[PDB]
């Protein structure tokens, strides 16, 4: 029931589940660096005690809403129940706050706050709450 441009092609997915490739944890899954169609992507795989409802909860925002302040989904599989989304070049904000608290010029802080606010305003104008910021 989803656009046909988001279906995985397992022949073009170079994915290696290992702690060395871990990027971060999530609400109900873990994300690993991988390659999809010859590009660096991030694959989120869910847990053993999960269901399709969590995947569709991801997809109700990741498949119908497009915005420069929201992460982009490239593919969404069913057989292993994973998501394939973009890869952030500079990582999460937690690493910047903890490890690299020297590039946080006030212009960068203002841009980050403005982009997060724009994403929130789009989400809230699209009948959707986020609840985890």
């Amino acid at each position: 029931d989803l656009p046909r441009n988001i279906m995985l092609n397992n022949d073009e997915l170079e994915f290696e589940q290992a702690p060395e490739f871990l990027l971060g944890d999530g609400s109900f899954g873990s994300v690993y660096r991988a390659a999809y169609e010859g590009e660096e992507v991030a694959v989120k795989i869910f847990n053993k005690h999960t269901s399709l409802r969590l995947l569709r909860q991801e997809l109700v925002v990741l498949c119908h809403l497009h915005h420069p302040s929201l992460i982009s989904l490239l593919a969404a599989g069913i057989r292993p129940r994973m998501l394939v989304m973009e890869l952030a070049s500079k990582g999460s904000l937690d690493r910047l706050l903890q490890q690299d608290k020297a590039s946080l010029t006030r212009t960068l802080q203002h841009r980050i706050a403005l982009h997060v606010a724009d994403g929130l305003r789009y989400l809230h104008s699209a009948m959707i709450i986020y609840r985890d910021l």
Binding site: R4, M7, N9, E14, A35, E37, G38, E39
Partner: protein, 385 residues
């Protein structure tokens, strides 16, 4: 600055010159994405087919004469069971050799077709089929699982046309993963088929409604690529036809000579010797004059014309090398006139490697230049006042 002000300089990753005086007609890429990035080439400089192996990371060329007649086309078959890999050849005589990608002593021929084998396109519908297109308008469907046998027969020998009409235009559809209909071409007619192997459409193309470009519209079809419509190129045809897959009529007719006229002024044999279509960005036309036409796939726009690197483009195809995809392998014939003006055989076949991001960088770079220009003007104005 003008040489550095080009996207051809940023997105031309590698350029390989083959040994002296070799005429390679077809190429395929050994692409398991993890096994070995390399190229297989079918030479045609002699009337005795040679298969040559090009190791890309070492630029190592190793040729081998195995076919009585020149190899016309090549295909790579990968059977996931037992991690089997093979390559199948199509010779002008009609034979069909099969040699292992890894093993070198696994030669075993197959059924000798009636005439020359002009296509060997392989794809999976699920079940994998190795489609054999004989030069007599005959698509001899063959079974991938049967390639192990030393000599076999086609599963279903389809007939599309007579001997006068050649079948040399196999293709598939990459839109919405519609791996059901594989639009081909026999003679001057476009045929379609499915896993039922029933011709859903057989459309005649030799007639031109305008009847003016019919000189270039009454030639055998050479290549077809389909994203949302049909793109048709013919022998010695400076025109490309954009046909509708529903109304079965010519929607558009793009003139390659019209786009080349801006660069030639500064009998036009601007043929279309190959044609490749990038996913959703642009259309890559390969001309017989050494030019490469990047057209905007959106409606009509010409992104760029690339020349002064080859004398004639022969084979253009998309590969993936060393977990770095997005490389448009382009093979050209650089024929220097040093030997003589009578077109004496001094031909360097150059296998250059591009980056199919190239349609993007053009706009990127030009925007850059515009911005800098503006800045310059602003600074000069601030200098005057």
């Amino acid at each position: 600055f003008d040489i550095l002000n080009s996207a051809e300089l940023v997105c031309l990753t590698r350029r390989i010159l083959l040994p002296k005086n070799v005429i390679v007609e077809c190429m395929v890429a050994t692409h398991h994405n993890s096994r070995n990035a390399s190229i297989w080439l079918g030479c045609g400089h002699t009337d005795r087919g040679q298969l040559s192996f090009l190791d890309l990371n070492t630029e190592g060329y190793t040729s081998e004469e195995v076919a009585d007649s020149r190899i016309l086309c090549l295909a790579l078959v990968h059977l996931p069971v037992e991690k089997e890999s093979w390559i199948v050849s199509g010779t002008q005589s009609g034979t069909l050799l099969v040699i292992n990608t890894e093993d070198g002593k696994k030669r075993h021929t197959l059924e000798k077709m009636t005439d020359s084998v002009t296509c060997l396109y392989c794809n999976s519908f699920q079940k994998n089929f190795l489609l054999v297109g004989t030069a007599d308008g005959k698509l001899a469907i063959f079974e991938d699982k049967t390639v192990k046998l030393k000599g076999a027969a086609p599963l279903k020998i389809l007939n599309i046309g007579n001997v006068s009409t050649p079948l040399m235009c196999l293709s598939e559809s990459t839109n919405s993963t519609e791996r059901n209909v594989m639009w081909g071409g026999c003679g001057t007619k476009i045929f379609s088929f499915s896993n039922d192997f029933t011709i859903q459409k057989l459309i005649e193309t030799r007639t031109s409604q305008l009847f003016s470009y019919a000189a270039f519209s009454d030639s055998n079809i050479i290549t077809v690529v389909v994203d949302t419509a049909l793109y048709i190129a013919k022998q010695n045809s400076p025109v490309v036809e954009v046909w509708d897959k529903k109304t079965e009529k010519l929607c558009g007719l793009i003139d390659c000579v019209h786009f080349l006229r801006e660069v030639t002024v500064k009998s036009y044999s601007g043929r279309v010797k190959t044609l490749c279509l990038q996913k959703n960005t642009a259309l890559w036309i390969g001309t017989g004059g050494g030019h490469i036409l990047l057209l905007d796939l959106s409606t009509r726009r010409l992104i760029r014309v690339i020349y002064n690197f080859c004398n004639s483009v022969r084979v253009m195809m998309t590969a993936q090398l060393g977990s770095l995809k997005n490389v448009m392998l382009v093979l050209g014939y650089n024929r220097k006139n040093t030997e003589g003006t009578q077109k004496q055989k001094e031909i360097q076949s150059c296998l250059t490697v591009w980056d199919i991001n190239l349609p993007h960088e053009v706009q990127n770079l030009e925007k850059h230049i515009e911005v800098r220009k503006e800045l310059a003007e602003k600074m000069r104005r601030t200098s005057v006042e």
